[PDB]
Design a protein around this ligand. Structure first.
Ligand SMILES: C[C@@H]1O[C@H](O)[C@@H](O)[C@H](O)[C@@H]1O
Ligand SMILES: C[C@@H]1O[C@H](O)[C@@H](O)[C@H](O)[C@@H]1O
Ligand SMILES: C[C@@H]1O[C@H](O)[C@@H](O)[C@H](O)[C@@H]1O
Ligand SMILES: C[C@@H]1O[C@H](O)[C@@H](O)[C@H](O)[C@@H]1O
Lengths: 329, 327, 317, 323
């Protein structure tokens, strides 16, 4: 049986990690601010791939410690960790054989960060989940989003429209066949048992492309629960937006629910964003979600040195002290 | 006097700064107070006529002495120290000798010290009183007029704007007519006073310090007097931030450090620099480990409220403390 | 006023009311981003919320100094809340004693003092009025709209007045809304601009009656597009929607004063947004939320003056 | 020496703090620096082997000496003072005598002092140098080991963790082998130096202070020396905030925009444009130069808010001076 179903129902609390090249710019570019989402900075300022990709040469997070990050999650009662394997910028945070645009090949750090977090989660008894941008890829000429630019974004366009301005010649199929599916096979084959699969903004993928991803994860990771944002109705648990939380909606036939939130207002690390939700806010939101059978996936944006920001760490630990006190009395 | 043994093990107190300064909330005519919003009258040399008119707007509809004492109690605080009269010279109790007080001069028309005394008595918390015995900006002969060679959290130590003739200022007149009469009032009314919180005497003679000590002793035999009354007239030493382990003799081994949660004692809109729960708990643990009481200040807002972030950080520091003490 | 509005470029908006005294906080808990919605957010009974009037004594309120700040910043008009959703009038209303003149120790007509200050300085004067929502009125609007979330709880007062089936907005419209609109349009001289808000309950006919009333009493008053379908002179554009046009914004994230909101837009942000709007022929109406003492917050004033210094420097070079 | 007349009327300078400390950005293993993020090595007693490894991660891809000098110039600043070597003992120039420097030890592999010297020359700005002549946490005989009866923005004045034997310490060795050789390097290799910024001498003998003074005089005849080289060896007095003899009537007050000299992610306490302009006007009215510090971030950038507040202070100043 898949007892990840029963496990997910009672899991209550997860850590999400956003970490990438965007973390080095830290919500700032040439004296101007990112939107609230610092991880969208490449689109926000239309930073050419040649320049943005050169951030890889400065990626050397000397204080990255997968063990200490997992130990914080565990101390907070988090039962799983979801990490960005590849965000919208298309930079892989694992050793990708199909694309050299990755943290292993292109940075002096020269380490597989997904691998180190997979190993740390295994040793601590935490379940391990993977975030992958299956639609948007700003590094790929045929990256998705080029049909969706009638709606505003946390950057400029959904796609890379500056390096790749000819929208009528764009064919996502090529990106899907050559990068998206090959990379999904890599992350689902090389990093042990994957509990959760976190797909984002499905704007371009056909039904068939969503189905192919679903079928691939099922084959490689039989017990992996797929998030409702894969597109076109292919999933195991529903990712609820802030507006969808109890006081259209997606059916959840397994009754599995998760809301992702961040501690400040950005997913990626941002120097200027000190708007940290208080311990009381974190604990009360958690209790509310859990009471309605919804998992709280709570995001950390690691800094350029690979660190949990001091205030993210203090607020997580203080929320846990409030929770433990509330559960004793 | 088993207030001695009680004080030794008390570990944690609430301080309250509340006055007319609370209404300006760290801002005057588009400009900022210093870090100390309660010093705003001196900072901008606000004439007594104008500053005193703040009394007409003092109507804190949400002031609840019971809820304030319940917060202190939930946090493991064993006593409460409150400003009866700060440097501005505005009494926060019904003073018979001076009509410049919260009872006579405000539409609130209530004795706030009396309500806190009653609330502390019913909840079993010890009750302490802060009184500015030297500085009084409302009094023509208020102290500080000899000390203006050293900078302040305002301009001058004294009211030098309403009362500019520093030669033939005579503190004795303020001491005899306001300071000692008012100290007798707070120490006679309001029941048993556990702690007496005087401010660093800049103008007081030895004899004037002695007279205050002797008065508190007579009226409140078991009241512990803070070391800032004047040289050698005290029961416990008030240690400043700079005086804390990693100095005034304390023959009873009694020590207390006062601190605030943000950087101001009085309420300040613009000061959101709230010490984190971890900072509050760790500083408390450090002080207590050295046998020092942590007196932790709240600056009540214009409606008589504990600021939301002061209350959240106090309760979170308590949750961290309880968790640390179980494991 | 048509030609004048086209070239006006910059206005000051004022949110000021009983909500300003709670300042984004109630019994240890935060308002939403909108501190002026606090009564709905915590369902504060009218008896308690109304008692805030007894504590409304803003000793530092100075309409002359507020207009002088707007003028120094190159603002050519001022729009002020005469009555927000809570239903508390900030002028001497003859039809309702729930107003700043009758119910507060301040005992002054704040709209009157701003009207006089604007006239003497040569600034145009505009009026905000909540024609639909009124939390003080048993038949206040919004009781049909609670399928969509708000910056409080419900659109209406559903706590003092929980019987939604017995509610008839017509009664509120006839007895308070239209009488009060006649008062503000009759008693405070020439009104340049009329700022109505979310029409959720108003019939077409009720919107028409308001339009016709403002037209009669204030022939030259330009009406904002949020009165109701097709009854207006200029379009109020939201941030997402960016020949008369105006966009309203605030300096922090709240319209009413909120002491916990220190998220002040920088001078550079204020100037650049203004330049962008003006380049598209859109007026920037920029909101101040006055504090409990009637003051422009220190940081609102510093950022307004610094934005003006950046603007003047950019326009010289 | 018409640097004297020039300094009298200069009114406004940019200071730069930039080093390995900038990478930690006021945070170490989940704890905060003091208000001074540049003191982080002493604050947490970070061993030299670990702290020095920050050099391997120093790759500021957005460092642009021309854009930094252009900002200073737009703000009416007439000079730039930069940290050549702070207390940690890491040189921000290509030092021949010590390989513990930004050129030899970092992948950036560039002389940052040289690029700022060249940028200042081309823009017509005067160029000044900060050097920690007493404290050196990288040197076994670094100063401060006599001064630990007074508290610091870290722990000890000296490196007392890598070098705990205080009785075997002899500053003379550090002075002879690193301090004076390095002062000769910065005063020889980067063209005309207008200003020399030494820090309060705690360990230096009178003779060692004299030798520094005499060396700067020989190599840079027109260089004005700050009063924090020992008793009576200076050309202008560095006034503290609380102090607001000078036989040339030359005065300068240094301040920072937030509360830290080095970059600190957690310190968003930026003085407002109005505060910067009013403090400047006050200092200038008393004949005091305002030296205003920027702490560059790990990518070599002026923090967004430091740049916005500098430009807005200038707009307020220009407006005030027209009306
Ligand atoms: C968790 C969030 O999902 C969104 O759709 C993304 O666009 C954001 O970057 C973020 O990762
Ligand atoms: C507790 C504090 O003691 C200081 O010395 C006073 O000057 C402050 O205003 C405050 O009362
Ligand atoms: C200007 C804004 O318009 C909205 O409709 C209101 O609900 C807000 O409180 C504010 O007054
Ligand atoms: C300019 C400042 O004053 C001194 O030099 C140092 O102690 C500080 O870190 C900083 O360099």
């Amino acid at each position: 049986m898949n007892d990840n179903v029963a496990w997910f129902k009672q899991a209550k609390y997860g850590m999400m990690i956003h970490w990438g090249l965007y973390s080095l710019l830290a919500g700032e570019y040439r004296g101007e601010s990112s939107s609230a989402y610092a991880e969208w900075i490449q689109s926000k300022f239309q930073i050419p791939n040649a320049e943005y990709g050169n951030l890889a040469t400065a990626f050397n997070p000397l204080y990255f410690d997968a063990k200490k990050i997992v130990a914080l999650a565990k101390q907070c009662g988090m039962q799983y960790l979801v990490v960005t394997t590849k965000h919208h910028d298309g930079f892989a945070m694992y050793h990708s054989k199909v694309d050299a645009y990755n943290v292993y090949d292109a940075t002096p750090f020269h380490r597989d960060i997904i691998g180190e977090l997979a190993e740390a989660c295994q040793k601590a008894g935490l379940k391990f989940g993977l975030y992958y941008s299956q639609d948007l890829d700003w590094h790929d000429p045929n990256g998705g989003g080029y049909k969706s630019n009638d709606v505003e974004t946390a950057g400029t366009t959904w796609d890379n429209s500056w390096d790749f301005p000819d929208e009528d010649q764009k064919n996502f199929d090529l990106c899907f066949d050559n990068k998206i599916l090959p990379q999904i096979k890599e992350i689902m084959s090389n990093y042990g048992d994957i509990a959760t699969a976190w797909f984002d903004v499905p704007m371009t993928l056909s039904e068939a492309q969503s189905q192919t991803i679903y079928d691939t994860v099922r084959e490689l990771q039989p017990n992996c629960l797929i998030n409702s944002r894969l597109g076109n109705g292919k999933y195991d648990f529903v990712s609820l937006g802030d507006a969808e939380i109890p006081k259209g909606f997606k059916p959840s036939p397994l009754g599995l629910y998760e809301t992702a939130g961040t501690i400040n207002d950005s997913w990626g690390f941002s120097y200027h964003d000190q708007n940290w939700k208080t311990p009381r806010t974190l604990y009360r939101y958690k209790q509310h979600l859990n009471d309605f059978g919804i998992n709280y996936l709570l995001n950390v944006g690691l800094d350029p040195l690979g660190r949990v920001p001091m205030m993210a760490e203090e607020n997580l630990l203080a929320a846990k002290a409030l929770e433990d006190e509330a559960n004793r009395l």
